[PDB]
Symmetry: D2
Subunit: 387 residues, 4 copies
Amino acid sequence: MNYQPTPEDRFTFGLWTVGWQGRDPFGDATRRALDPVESVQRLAELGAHGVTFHDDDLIPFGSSDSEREEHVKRFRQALDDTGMKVPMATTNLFTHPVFKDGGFTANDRDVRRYALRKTIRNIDLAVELGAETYVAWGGREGAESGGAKDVRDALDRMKEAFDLLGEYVTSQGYDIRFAIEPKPNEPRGDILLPTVGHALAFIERLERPELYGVNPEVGHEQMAGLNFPHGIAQALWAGKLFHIDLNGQNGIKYDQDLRFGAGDLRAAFWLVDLLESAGYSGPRHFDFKPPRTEDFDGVWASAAGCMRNYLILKERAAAFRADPEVQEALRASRLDELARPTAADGLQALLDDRSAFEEFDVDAAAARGMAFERLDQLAMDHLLGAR
Amino acid sequence: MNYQPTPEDRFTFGLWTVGWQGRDPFGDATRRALDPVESVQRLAELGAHGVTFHDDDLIPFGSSDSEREEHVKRFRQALDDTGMKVPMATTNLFTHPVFKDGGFTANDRDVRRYALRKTIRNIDLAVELGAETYVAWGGREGAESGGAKDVRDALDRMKEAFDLLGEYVTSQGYDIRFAIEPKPNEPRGDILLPTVGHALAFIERLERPELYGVNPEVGHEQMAGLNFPHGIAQALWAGKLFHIDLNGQNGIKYDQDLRFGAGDLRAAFWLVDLLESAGYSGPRHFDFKPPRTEDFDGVWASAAGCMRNYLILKERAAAFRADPEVQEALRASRLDELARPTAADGLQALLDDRSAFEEFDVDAAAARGMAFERLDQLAMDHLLGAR
Amino acid sequence: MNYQPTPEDRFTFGLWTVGWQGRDPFGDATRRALDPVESVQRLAELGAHGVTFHDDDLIPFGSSDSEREEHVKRFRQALDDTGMKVPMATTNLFTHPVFKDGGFTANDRDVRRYALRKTIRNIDLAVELGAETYVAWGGREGAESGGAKDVRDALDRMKEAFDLLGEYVTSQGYDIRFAIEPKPNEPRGDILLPTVGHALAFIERLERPELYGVNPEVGHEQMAGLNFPHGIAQALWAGKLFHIDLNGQNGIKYDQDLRFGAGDLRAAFWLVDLLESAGYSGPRHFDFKPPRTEDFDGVWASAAGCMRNYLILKERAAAFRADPEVQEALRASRLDELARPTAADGLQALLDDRSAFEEFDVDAAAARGMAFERLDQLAMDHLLGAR
Amino acid sequence: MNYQPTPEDRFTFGLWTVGWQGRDPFGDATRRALDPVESVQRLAELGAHGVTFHDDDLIPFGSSDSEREEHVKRFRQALDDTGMKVPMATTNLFTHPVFKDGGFTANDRDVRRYALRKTIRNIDLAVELGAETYVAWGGREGAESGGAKDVRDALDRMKEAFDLLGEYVTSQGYDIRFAIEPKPNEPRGDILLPTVGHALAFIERLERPELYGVNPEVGHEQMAGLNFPHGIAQALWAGKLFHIDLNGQNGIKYDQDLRFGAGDLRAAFWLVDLLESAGYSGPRHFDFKPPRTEDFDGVWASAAGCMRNYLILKERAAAFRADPEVQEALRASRLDELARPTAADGLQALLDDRSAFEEFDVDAAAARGMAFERLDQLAMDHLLGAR
Ligand SMILES: OC[C@H]1OC[C@H](O)[C@@H](O)[C@@H]1O
Ligand SMILES: OC[C@H]1OC[C@H](O)[C@@H](O)[C@@H]1O
Ligand SMILES: OC[C@H]1OC[C@H](O)[C@@H](O)[C@@H]1O
Ligand SMILES: OC[C@H]1OC[C@H](O)[C@@H](O)[C@@H]1O
Ligand SMILES: [Mn+2]
Ligand SMILES: [Mn+2]
Ligand SMILES: [Mn+2]
Ligand SMILES: [Mn+2]
Ligand SMILES: [Mn+2]
Ligand SMILES: [Mn+2]
Ligand SMILES: [Mn+2]
Ligand SMILES: [Mn+2]
């Protein structure tokens, strides 16, 4: 009881994750810059299935079109040498000072045109490399002060940018979908579409909604004090869980990005319970930063523990759902009754049913216990291996 | 410079607001129970336009159908004597112990049938009394522990309950819409559809979405650390701001419900700026609790300051938008450019525009300042009357 | 692997905990009122060591002095019949409407005199029943608005109240100490001495500081987003961990009071690691509320899981500290070096040590990894039983 | 009604504030690097009284001792040319990768020796330049994971470091005090002494406590959801408000550092009310970052609005306290009674006073209203200039 990943677990990492050199808003870098080749080799050794990338993780901002190709060719060699895939790719529209007021909602209209052209060039690459999902994190879309952004106009510009992306993909015939990744704040004071629910809502107003879903990340819902497995339940109920970012976060503070398992560990248990019982079948992607305390040995430790923690919690969630005593408890708590329709008899029948009101014994019903605490300690004893 | 409401400002209060007897989770009541008649009289004197009610604020839980009528008739007299309206009404599906695991998503299916029948009886009343909007706050829909609620099944039950309400209203021919009011937590650990964005998303999956919008409340988005005027911008951009609850809240903690102005005062300025410049024309409804320190004189003080603060902030937001120097600033900050389409030239033109990429000077563009701090102190000097 | 408490584990519960009838700020009670006798019997059966009480949990507010005695005598019988102890007692200065603006810092001076007399009468009882610690939670000391409380004057009144308590105990010859329990907010907007650190600071200004320590509670530091085991480390470093309240809390929201283990489970692991390795030897007291979903079977389940979770986490923290690989890791991470003095050579030696500055190789030192991620996955594999 | 600072308002800025080049954890710098000379000139023109500095803001890390002197001499010239003072100085023990696990509590003992020697060299400079206060922000003292730092050992190392600093200052005969600046988190997961209350407590355990106070910052208490004017009240009640950092923050999130007034504006009103009515007479120091949207014109706008907002709020707090109606209200609310001793009659008299218990009419007393809402709208109408 040992927990060894293989490439079939679908574990992926961004280049920026094991590649983060530990430069924070108060500190210089503490690690040198990894070659993308490197990282591909090391990650394949650890059992990973693939990697993801921003355009500028792969090709240095500014690159000519003969360096560009060079970068790509090296990359491609390493994937072919290791068997690693590239399921997902994304654009950096945050680093470069030109992005300081956003990329698709920046007040300057020339910036907003340049954000779309940067994006479209990388969609073509991603498609080349075989990615299925193209993520958009608008981390610079938002404001520090209430008169600097009209939000209605800015959502109009964001819808315009996603609609022209949708056009371009369907005009090229590409098989690629888009996944918006919410974040509530940081590095802007407030970030537009700050949660999964605001990103799901916004999708429903694009021209082609079936092209877009979400990429929620553990630590960014938690940065609003929200229940991340409830978030993901709703995204699954909408049909829009295209991709996920897995990692940890200790409560409402700056975005920590700790390895997956760290943070809220019970939330991580019920998230694995839910992905595996809903049958999510996209990549289990880790968007994490190895703390800057760490050297490169710490880096590969940290990326391994991500995968380990995922497999342990999988095993404990599967044994919980398999346990007859737990399935008895779930009946005692009437989760079987939550899955049945309230009134499949229809409205008229409901309205003529005296047992539904006139002759409903409210006291007898209020007196029933829900038996949730016994059910939740069962879940505790399963996660701790006490069962 | 004086700020006197009239019934044309559309100011409304819930019965439960000035009626709250100050019973908290650690303390007994500190004020006796007001007659609904009372409150109607006192509120009309203060300049209010109307009141709102839960079924059980008006008619005591349990009431026969000859007390029921009695209650209603008294009520009706007071409205006719004062000219007060009833724009909005709502159901109590939280107080009574039968609701302890929810009303439309309670695990027991009999409870869920009884929640719908209670609801439908009050829709008929509301319609009688002339309300235009029927609010649903599911404050007991949610969980304290992750195995006690399957969220996918529970959203299925919530959609079923709202769809049968929609059926019933359109079968009766009623002119009534529904407004879901999010809250992230309290009194459940976590509450389903915790934010405006999750409530907007959920709406898009009902059978008749055009019947449903939102009733956001200041202090409940703030309980997630979210920017309430950005929330309301998005609800306005979706066409779904049916009703609002106005009040204050100091940050991420239990739901304070302070009078409107208290709390985040700058957030209250940019919320009034936005309602009045978007032309919101529903009720300005105050969902607040006069602190339990207060006697009944404190109560009517507190409900007056709600209205005052709203009028002061209206005047300061109007003088800010009217000020030529502020309109110069907003051009300096390129809010005029945020309102223009990014690419009304279309995708092909964008892609053949060299000035959009190949010949876009990114340094010159990154060098421009956005001039937001000068713009935001203008907004500060306007709100403080320093202008 | 089974985890059975005994009275030697020092497990205690307040009467108010298993006794909470589930009345919340939106809902009526869902359970009838337990006799204190009852609770003493049931808790002894579960393995508990004792109970604690507010004056008004035991004797009904208002009680004559012949009911008073009656109450006490019954109580006393049950303790003698079960062997249960009463290590800690406390005053209700929150419920009764007279307390609405506080008890020792209420603006009315007559209230403040009545708070002290209520307190002193219960210190005499507590002493009768054998308690060693007298807790003070000033849950109504604080304000909703900034002009309603001058905080300097209020800390003067709080110091005056604690100094006269100290006088009274040392004039009576009682062996009793006091423990202040911080809470940051709820039911007041803001509560004075909101954290362990503000309560430790305040102690240092009383006349007899050696009489006072703290009673921190898991969920109340977490309500400020603070690291509860770091809090308790500091209280232990000051010599002031007199008593503790154990329970759970999911982040920054209203005070949930979930059973102990729920909430932040990793925080609960490092808190047990720290109490047991520092050798805390007071009561392990559970200040929790069985959710109002629950019937009385749910109640006793919930109070059992408190104790279970504590024993499981004890075992996992002991196996982590006992593991040779973990003790190697802790050397790799230089926790051995953190325990050594920086400069026991003294200031002059430090200043003449060239290896400390002039000839300190800062790059070589920055290059060392701290090896914390490998150390923290070891801790994860120990808590999950994966080791 | 105009609000013009002069050098007598005691307004100071850190070099790092107007000097921040806008490099964030997702973005490059958006402004070039200001010469310290520059900033001194520009700030004197705006009305400032002085500046503050980290060692490494002034002299580039690594500097020889002939560049060192050069740096200092230029600096000195600009102060002499403008009349600017240097009231406060501080050490950078956060940037350099050697600091990645802290400076005075870093696990490596050699680091901790090098942190103290860096510190002591800058105390000598500060003393040269005339500073009265030496701040310590331990922004890298803390941990991301619970086994990486034993907090008891780390507080022992922090006390050792502050005690040897105290020794060195009193051995040199310097007139300099120390001010610890709390922060709850960022850039570490958790930061030791996270609040004012934990920093006040810790002080009481140093060898010479009278040498140390606090430097609270608005936005860092707010990052715990705490009431910053209550914090500062307690620091004033302890005699330990040595210095302050003024700025804004919108709630519990990453450290924004917005100009002073932005953020919680009502909290800023009651903080100015309190500093000016307590007669705080240290520097009003602004620790803020001009957002990275801004060019250098935005920079000097932002630093001006800091000072403006402070003067406006001063005027509004003075007119509130001067208003007879407000002084009537404060009597109605019994703030006069909060300032009187509870029992200056002594314990025995309290205990023999029947009017204090046996014959205390609790109902009559609970029935009194506190009249706080009328008092708080008066405060609202004063801050908005509506009065
Ligand atoms: O999508 C791009 C990635 O870009 C950087 C963000 O910090 C991270 O959340 C994200 O997933
Ligand atoms: O909608 C009903 C009202 O019910 C009680 C809730 O606490 C309040 O938020 C709400 O607006
Ligand atoms: O100290 C008395 C007890 O009183 C009730 C409080 O809610 C709880 O935190 C506390 O421990
Ligand atoms: O004390 C030094 C200064 O150092 C940088 C910190 O971010 C700031 O809070 C502080 O005041
Ligand atoms: Mn993140
Ligand atoms: Mn991410
Ligand atoms: Mn509310
Ligand atoms: Mn509401
Ligand atoms: Mn609690
Ligand atoms: Mn407690
Ligand atoms: Mn700061
Ligand atoms: Mn600071």
